[PDB]
């Protein structure tokens, strides 16, 4: 059935991340066709069982069978790279803090607490359960840190940087938008604001222990909050746009990029959003009104074209 | 993006746990349009939380949306239905021991300790670890029911019940299977071997604790196999149908039933039975080879046709 196959579809995600998470996959490198009983000599899997595993990705569209052997497809080739940020995103999406998040999703929907169903299930709010988990923080920090050096080079295309002085990325995670950009937009003061334990160290970056809830410095003329606003729910989104308004002047900008809602595309990370952080995705009037609402007014509104999802870039200033 | 939605297959699995797991989805009975502003007031759900939930299930498929209304899909009025095999299933798929069980499937593939994903995760086998945990037996005993009273009609039309007189089901489970052939097929003999710290009680049922991998009674000209060898490996599957040929006589007959391995159907089942059994799904012509190791001959082979699976009927005496 099709509908027996889409209450088993977890079984897609599974299959996926015990053929990443393993290494099996980086065995795959420049969509070589690889002989699964020499896979099984070198690496000691059990050939039998592994070979069952092969049929199920041919299925899903992973591998490729010809002359009884298996490459990774054309656009599951990032599979084979460990570093990738789609080996972070299934080393993350079925972990057991995940799945526990997801049980207490249906029990969540009832409670009016404030608390997401990660709260319930592990007894913090996601980021401050993550300060104390090496596995969730690392994979988490690393996957924003691979599609903030993905989107960089088109952010530096459609936007003028050099007309800046003092740039700030207000939950910029390890840093790696501005690091980035400081390397071809060069002489200009960089800092990244985050919730650091210990302060990361980067040549000409100012790393910043802080809180966007609580407030922002001011005296910074560029202001980015990439992938941000879809972790809070509106009030917690007005609260950060607010406390933005407080800190920037006449001449200040403000750089909302994130996720955006587009009909066309799947509401599968708004519901992930929904139980990790208590947030949601927003379209670009959504992204808008929270806007007006803080009293900041929309300039510029371009779209950003990434293969997983499309991104809303919104140059933002004050009243 | 289309492998980001791949590895986000999860999403839609849980999604639809947190709709019939709270017992929201039994609100959409026989094809009704449900209000969520409505069912908000009544049962106590968040009303902007759900609507973005039932908005992924639109996209699903599982509800269709007329005028910001949601009704359940043809195909998906099974979840309104709280004792539907489907409801049980999803109950099953992503529960912890199973998040747990896929966890450890990567790594399982490494192992030649003859331990299933299932017990390195949990500490025993599948149904050794049944005994001492309720959810998973009552759940699991509840789909195997409810999936033996669904075909039970088809199996009454393609096989003469008539011709026989004492009846064995070899782990018949509940039992549902003959307590439904004896409702129309009367004054048999009837008896339910299966793992029992407590017997079932039924209207001339004789209900047997027993361990086929030990023995098969003797005595019975005929005998039941149903969704029983896909649980085992080939050597275990080999000693069931060994025991079977040392009960039965010439005149003797067993029915293996199972669901069976066709190219066009998904591969997903045989991931999972290898994970929760180290067991495999099997074509006609591998269930035939087994039957031939352990001394039967086939002598009457037919398909019937489910929803969600094809079914194998092979009829087998020994020689
Ligand atoms: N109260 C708070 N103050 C500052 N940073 C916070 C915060 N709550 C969450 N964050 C940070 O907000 C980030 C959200 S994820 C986005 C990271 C980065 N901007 C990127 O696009 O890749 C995380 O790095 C998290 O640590
Ligand atoms: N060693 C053993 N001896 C007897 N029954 C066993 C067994 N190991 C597993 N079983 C039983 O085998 C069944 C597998 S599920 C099949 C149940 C039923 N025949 C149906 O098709 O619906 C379970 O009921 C389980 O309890
Ligand atoms: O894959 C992502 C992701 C990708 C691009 C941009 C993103 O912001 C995210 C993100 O936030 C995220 C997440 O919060 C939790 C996850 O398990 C996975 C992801
Ligand atoms: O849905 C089934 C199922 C359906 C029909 C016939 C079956 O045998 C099964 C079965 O065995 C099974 C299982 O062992 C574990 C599960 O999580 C789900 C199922
Ligand atoms: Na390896």
Chains 1, 2 share one sequence.
């Not at 607490?113 to 090496?134: I, Q, T, V």
């Not at 800046?164 to 390890?174: A, P, W």
């Not at 992930?272 to 609402?293: C, H, I, P």
């Amino acid at each position: 059935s099709m509908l027996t196959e889409l209450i088993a579809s977890n079984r897609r995600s599974a299959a996926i991340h015990a053929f990443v998470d393993t290494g099996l996959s980086t065995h795959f490198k420049d969509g070589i066709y690889v002989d699964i009983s020499e896979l099984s000599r070198k690496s000691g899997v059990n050939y039998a069982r592994f070979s069952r595993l092969c049929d199920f990705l041919v299925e899903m569209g992973v591998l490729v069978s010809n002359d009884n052997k298996f490459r990774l497809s054309d656009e599951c080739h990032v599979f084979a790279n460990p570093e990738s940020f789609e080996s972070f995103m299934i080393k993350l999406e079925i972990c057991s803090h995940y799945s526990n998040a997801w049980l207490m999703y249906g029990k969540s929907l009832f409670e009016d607490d404030g608390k997401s169903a990660f709260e319930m299930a592990h007894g913090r709010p996601f980021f401050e359960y993550l300060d104390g988990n090496k596995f969730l923080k690392s994979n988490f920090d690393a996957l924003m840190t691979r599609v903030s050096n993905l989107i960089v080079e088109k952010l530096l295309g459609i936007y003028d940087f050099n007309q800046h002085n003092r740039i700030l990325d207000v939950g910029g995670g390890e840093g790696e938008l501005l690091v980035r950009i400081s390397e071809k937009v060069k002489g200009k003061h960089y800092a990244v604001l985050d919730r650091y334990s210990e302060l990361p160290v980067s040549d000409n970056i100012d790393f910043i222990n802080g809180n966007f809830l609580n407030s922002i410095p001011s005296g910074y003329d560029l202001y980015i909050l990439k992938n941000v606003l879809h972790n809070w729910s509106d009030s917690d989104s007005i609260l950060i746009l607010e406390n933005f308004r407080k800190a920037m002047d006449k001449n200040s900008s403000l750089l909302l990029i994130n996720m955006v809602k587009e009909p066309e595309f799947s509401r599968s990370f708004d519901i992930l959003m929904d139980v990790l952080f208590l947030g949601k995705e927003r379209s670009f009037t959504e992204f808008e009104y929270l806007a007006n609402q803080a009293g900041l007014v929309v300039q510029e509104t371009k779209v950003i074209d990434q293969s997983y999802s499309p991104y809303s870039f919104i140059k933002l200033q004050i009243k």
